[PDB]
Design a protein around this nucleic acid. Structure first.
Ligand SMILES: [Mg+2]
Ligand SMILES: [Mg+2]
Ligand SMILES: [Mg+2]
Ligand SMILES: [Mg+2]
Ligand SMILES: [Mg+2]
Ligand SMILES: [Mg+2]
Ligand SMILES: [Mg+2]
Ligand SMILES: [Mg+2]
Ligand SMILES: [Mg+2]
Ligand SMILES: [Mg+2]
Ligand SMILES: [Mg+2]
Ligand SMILES: [Mg+2]
Ligand SMILES: [Mg+2]
Ligand SMILES: [Mg+2]
Ligand SMILES: [Mg+2]
Ligand SMILES: [Mg+2]
Ligand SMILES: [Mg+2]
Ligand SMILES: [Mg+2]
Ligand SMILES: [Mg+2]
Ligand SMILES: [Mg+2]
Ligand SMILES: [Mg+2]
Ligand SMILES: [Mg+2]
Ligand SMILES: [Mg+2]
Ligand SMILES: [Mg+2]
Ligand SMILES: [Mg+2]
Ligand SMILES: [Mg+2]
Ligand SMILES: [Mg+2]
Ligand SMILES: [Mg+2]
Ligand SMILES: [Mg+2]
Ligand SMILES: [Mg+2]
Ligand SMILES: [Mg+2]
Ligand SMILES: [Mg+2]
Ligand SMILES: [Mg+2]
Lengths: 47, 96, 82
RNA sequence: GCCCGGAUAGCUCAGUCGGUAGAGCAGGGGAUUGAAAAUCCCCGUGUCCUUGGUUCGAUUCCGAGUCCGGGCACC
RNA sequence: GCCCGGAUAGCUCAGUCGGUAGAGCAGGGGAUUGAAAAUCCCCGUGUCCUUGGUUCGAUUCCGAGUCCGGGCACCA
RNA sequence: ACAUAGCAUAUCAGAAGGCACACCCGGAGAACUGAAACAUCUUAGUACCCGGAGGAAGAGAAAGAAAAUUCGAUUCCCUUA
RNA sequence: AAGCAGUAAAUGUGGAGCCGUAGCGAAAGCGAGUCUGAAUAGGGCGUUUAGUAUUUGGUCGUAGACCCGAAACCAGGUGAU
RNA sequence: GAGGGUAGCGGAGAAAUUCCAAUCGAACCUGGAGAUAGCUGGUUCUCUCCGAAAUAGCUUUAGGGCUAGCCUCAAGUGAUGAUUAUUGGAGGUAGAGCACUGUUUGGACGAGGCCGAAUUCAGACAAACUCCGAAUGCCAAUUAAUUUAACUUGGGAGUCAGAACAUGGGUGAUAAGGUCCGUGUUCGAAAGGGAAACAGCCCAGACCACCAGCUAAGGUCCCAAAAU
RNA sequence: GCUGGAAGGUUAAGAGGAGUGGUUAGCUUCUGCGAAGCUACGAAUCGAAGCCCCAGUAAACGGCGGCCGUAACUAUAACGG
RNA sequence: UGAUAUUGAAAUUCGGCACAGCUAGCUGUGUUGGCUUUCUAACCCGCACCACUUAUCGUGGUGGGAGACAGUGUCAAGCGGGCAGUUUGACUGGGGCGGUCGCCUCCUAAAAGGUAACGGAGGCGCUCAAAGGUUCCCUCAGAAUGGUUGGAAAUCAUUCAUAGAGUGUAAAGGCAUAAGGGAGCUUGACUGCGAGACCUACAAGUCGAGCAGGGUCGAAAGACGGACUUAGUGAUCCGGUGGUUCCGCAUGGAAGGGCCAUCGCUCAACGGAUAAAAGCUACCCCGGGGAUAACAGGCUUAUCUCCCCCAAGAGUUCACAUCGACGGGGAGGUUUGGCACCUCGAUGUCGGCUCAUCGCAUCCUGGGGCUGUAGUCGGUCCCAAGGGUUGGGCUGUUCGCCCAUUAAAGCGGUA
RNA sequence: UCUGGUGACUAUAGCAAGGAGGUCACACCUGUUCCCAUGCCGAACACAGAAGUUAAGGUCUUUAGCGACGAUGGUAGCCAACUUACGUUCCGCUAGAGUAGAACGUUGCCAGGC
């Protein structure tokens, strides 16, 4: 039930919000979403 | 005072800061020049004492929202982009 | 002068405003709300699209008509023509 | 007329936070030994208070309920 | 949301600074002696918390990790 | 014991007290009240108290203001607001 | 405005200032349009002109602010007949 | 008995909250000081025009306030406001009904080795039961007839203690001049006539004069106008 | 609560000064070191009483239980769990 | 109780740190704190003697005793009702007590919306990397009928099954085009927005066609800016972290601000007074109220006192001489209450003495019926207010029991 | 007209029964090499084909027995009026629900072939 932020790896910032429900996927969570000023789809990492 | 309920100026949030140097150009429009003649100059010693501008804080910008209608010669402080076309339309230099 | 029992519930919800918000015949505009419900009591027809389980709202201009097309179901259409 | 604690081997207590019942006193049958009392084995049935509902499932959560212990008790 | 201590025979503690696991309470079997309790021998399984990496080798050093004890706690 | 405190005579008028305490300058300094309660805050460095002067006291001759070209001791009035 | 002259004449001078002729944005800055925004897309606030000075009314704010009334608090003193 | 001491954040007390200049849970007298008061009482000359509310939301808030609601002048916009006929519509009450979850009393129906266990026929009940389902109200016709409003902006408020009747309801005991909502009327803020007198019921709205006539509600032998 | 105890945890002013930031002398000249100076911060370590810890004290403050069973007719229990 | 000043000398030690040398540990070796003592000039002696002086104060010398401690300042911790300013909510059929305080769903609610009460029923302060998006395909719980195991019912088939199942969560409204159940891929659980509506005091609150940039799924048409809806949350201020084309008080930097994204509150009394808050007054004080109680009027009759129907039964036999189970209908306004209408700018409150006055549902006396009335007594009922209705013990008593009588020791209203 | 494909019509249209045929057009089957695929099995999905069959599906003609629609009259409720404290009447408009009369075994657009 933990809030966690996703990190635009080339963008060099933090932009999104998710809800990683803790022990049902305790690993790192990496998706493909939009990251502006780069206008692409970067991997966003659960940090 | 809404009676214990907190007033309207506690819910709304505050934002901003003013400045320490917020140079306020006395904005003379371009329409006001359509009264005089000979096209000699316009001047921070003259454009005061023809009653047009008074107590210019710093700089007297020529914003353009009238019609020049004369081959006039200016000497202002600094300009606007469209009105600087109107002075060079009919013909006249300056010293920005 | 005896200590009376405690009540249990009270405790109502607030309200929501439901029902029709425009009526048969008049002239509506392309964002307005026709009808709204917590379910599906009125299906949409042509030129009327649903929302999130609520708020049948007109797509484009015109006047409204109510109509049934089954034995129980009812629908709403808007015809722009005049 | 009001809020809680609960009825847990025949006796006394235990967990009893929905899949998940324990001890000791008692009883019975052996052994002891002149005969009983001690003393030592081996055993069992509990009741999870009446009853319905959230029930994959209630000893376990609500309340239609009996009884009693803790405070009620106001000018 | 933060820094440490660690899960070391069934119970309690010990070293556990990479080659290098110990005690006592408990349990079982003998002996005692009318019968138990003491009392005396002889024994065993530890767990070095889940898991990966620096690994000639990790109970031992990092951290992906569960639980609890010591401080957090500021002028929202 | 050397001198000092101490002690004895002679001159001097310096002080003390009072003031309109109205105005001023330093020492010391509350609470009622407002915040719709109240403790930081504010009523306020206000009233009471005490000390020293004046016809006026205090300030004062830049270790200043300023940013352009600089002008210039302090006080007070109007605007900056 | 203050000041300076003047039957404590309400009139002469004084243009330091204030408001208005242009807004938008937190700000740099931009300008009849800016602002957010990748956008000339769409929006919010503007543009097309009337403000100004004095005064008679109505009402607000700060002062005790329609009058009359409390127990009660804090200073500074007078009282053991 | 005569002298003397202890003074308010204090003094004295064989302790009672007793005593301290006819007193005291903290004396008196000035000054801050016209303390504050969401609380009572009071507010002075006349006449014309129009004239409400006692509710909603939120509050250390329930007898106070702020905003919306209802009145008032001043400007505007100016057919948008009101009823009525016509058509088209939204929704599930009164009523009805047992197909639905539930409650029921009767008949035959099966379901062990002398009284009971699914279904079927004939009947009933319901705010949280509806296969049905009206009267009225309610929004809209670029609809037609009649009348007088409506809305936008800007100055000035007052109300946020309501009451009885007539009906739909909850609570109460189909009890109240009870309390709490809907919806109308009147009183509040309305005098007259009738109900013996009587704010709330029944007629009807007072600009003033007159020794004039018809009529409403109630009445007509007498008190007391009118038919023994 | 009060007295007595001395080791350990827990602390404050103060003493210490490992380091991190800002700045430019010089400098690759685009590109971070920064010596030194001056400044903003500050680490382990040391630093008592208290509180934890142990023992004593009731003419100190305070406290001084329930439930079942049994007797040569019944009754209740000297007694037992 | 510590630090540091006034505040000086000497020694013993026990240290950490900077170096050398050797076997992690010791010698010298220098910084460098402490720790015990030991002196003596500061300081203190309500410490004896002498002078000012004839004097218990005081000043000065002399001898003694303590001694770098104390006493004093400055800064820092813990103690601290001894003393001070203060807070201690509201709703409420009067108040404390009990329970409540915001959101979600029904009903009451009177066929639009709205609509209260301490009216009736239930929940929430989240959960899900797939239970979200897309493209395809499938239809249920049950009722029978038989079939290794037998739950009555854990799988298998066949047939009749309109939704009687299921939808992560409580209820209503929906769904069999599925919005239910599987299977393949993937992140639209995007960025910048938004014509116009609904609701509304405000702040908030939801619904949005379409527009650009980048996609996912699909053959394509199209769908997708979270889960069938409606709950699952908290203004401002202040602070933290990540960016920033922005300001940065001579100029250049920094420190600090502002924007944009985000975290910290059971502030749960949920529009949150503050960063931080509990009780008793019978010693009471002021301002107010019948808006709001106790006593007494008033309205009502649940209880209460009297009648009354119906008739099973008891009375050896007979329902009605007397008694009346189960059930119903009313009068009175004396008890216990309910409501808050008058009174808080005072309407004095229980018993008893004094003095009465009025009803009749009658206690005695007068008149009758009926008796399961031999007579004398007695039961029960009708008409009747003219008159009578006792002395003592007990407790404040009312009430009550008890003693001795009498023709009887009536029940009530009259604030 | 009739058979088929796609529309609209509230099941008046559908189920329930019963009789009739052919496959010129749907089916039934013949298989799985390929297109594709069954958490398995080509029954289904798809593909390749045409010897058989009208029994079945679908088509057509009867049956109102199952559901469904459904009038005229009534009665309850009810806006307005009147009278009255009665679980009320009385007068004037709208007017169901159930139940009976019954209608009903579909209708109609457009395509390609008879
Ligand atoms: Mg005396
Ligand atoms: Mg006392
Ligand atoms: Mg005395
Ligand atoms: Mg006063
Ligand atoms: Mg004052
Ligand atoms: Mg009028
Ligand atoms: Mg009904
Ligand atoms: Mg009803
Ligand atoms: Mg009534
Ligand atoms: Mg009303
Ligand atoms: Mg009126
Ligand atoms: Mg009269
Ligand atoms: Mg008369
Ligand atoms: Mg350093
Ligand atoms: Mg001396
Ligand atoms: Mg106190
Ligand atoms: Mg209250
Ligand atoms: Mg109460
Ligand atoms: Mg409604
Ligand atoms: Mg600078
Ligand atoms: Mg500077
Ligand atoms: Mg007393
Ligand atoms: Mg009373
Ligand atoms: Mg009665
Ligand atoms: Mg009474
Ligand atoms: Mg009332
Ligand atoms: Mg009064
Ligand atoms: Mg009076
Ligand atoms: Mg009195
Ligand atoms: Mg009588
Ligand atoms: Mg009498
Ligand atoms: Mg006696
Ligand atoms: Mg096959």
């Amino acid at each position: 039930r933990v809030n966690v932020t996703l990190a635009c790896t080339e963008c060099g910032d933090r932009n999104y919000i998710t809800t990683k429900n803790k022990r049902n996927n305790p690993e790192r969570i990496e998706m493909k979403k939009y990251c502006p000023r780069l206008n692409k789809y970067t991997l966003h990492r659960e940090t | 005072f809404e009676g214990g309920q907190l007033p309207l100026f506690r819910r709304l949030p505050k934002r901003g800061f003013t400045n320490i140097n917020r140079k306020e150009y006395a904005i003379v429009n371009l329409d006001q020049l359509n009264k005089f003649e000979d096209g000699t100059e316009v001047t921070p010693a003259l454009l005061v004492e023809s009653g047009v501008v008074k107590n210019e804080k710093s700089g007297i910008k020529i914003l353009g929202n009238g019609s020049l209608d004369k081959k006039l010669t200016v000497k202002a402080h600094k300009f606007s982009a469209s009105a600087a076309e109107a002075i060079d339309a009919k013909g006249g230099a300056h010293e920005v | 002068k005896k200590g009376v029992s405690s009540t249990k519930n009270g405790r109502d919800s607030e309200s929501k405003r439901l029902g029709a918000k425009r009526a048969d015949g008049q002239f509506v505009t392309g964002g307005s709300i026709l009808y709204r419900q917590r379910g599906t009591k009125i299906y949409p027809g042509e030129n009327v699209g649903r929302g999130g389980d609520d708020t049948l709202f007109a797509k484009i201009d015109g006047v409204v008509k109510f109509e049934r097309k089954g034995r129980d179901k009812k629908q709403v259409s808007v015809y722009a023509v005049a």
